């Protein structure tokens, strides 16, 4: 199966939220149903609108998005059946090539994906002792050194 990534489409952005969804439940499930809850309503009050990048599959059809602007990718997310495919790799590499000194984050929890990252190639840059509203559930800060 062939990939490429564009610009997102609005009516494509419910698709964004279901790989979200997805992407929480197989890697960031200590997310508790309530702030899970909350999450997925401001999600599916921003994906549809952010200015995200898609990796589509053949059918031009969203298998997984990244955030990108300035040189900080806020935001990767693809859904579990085709990540190991290869699509986090050409995904980092759409954001690297827009940005060579890239930056991105990752929730402490989901330490598969920080093992992930380290592996493509970022290094922790910061941290913060919770998520955003004072949440209990640390955000990491990475900057590409993967060299």
């Not at 960031?28 to 508790?32: A, R």
């Not at 002792?129 to 559930?137: N, R, S, T």
């Given at each position: 199966m062939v990939i490429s990534i564009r610009r997102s489409r609005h009516e494509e952005g419910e698709e964004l939220v279901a790989i979200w969804c997805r992407s929480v439940d197989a890697t960031?499930?200590?997310?508790?149903a309530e702030y899970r809850t909350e999450l997925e309503d401001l999600v599916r009050s921003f994906l549809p609108e952010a200015p995200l990048w898609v990796a589509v599959n053949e059918r031009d059809q969203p298998v997984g998005f990244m955030l990108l602007s300035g040189q900080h990718m806020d935001a990767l997310f693809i859904d579990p059946d085709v990540r190991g495919c290869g699509v986090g790799r050409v995904l980092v590499e759409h954001a690297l090539s827009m940005a060579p000194e890239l930056t991105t984050n990752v929730n402490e929890q989901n330490e598969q994906a920080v093992g992930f990252y380290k592996k493509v190639g970022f290094k922790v840059t910061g941290r913060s002792?919770?998520?955003?509203?004072?949440?209990?559930?640390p955000l990491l800060n990475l900057a590409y050194v993967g060299a």
């Open positions: 960031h499930d200590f997310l508790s002792e919770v998520d955003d509203l004072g949440k209990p559930y």
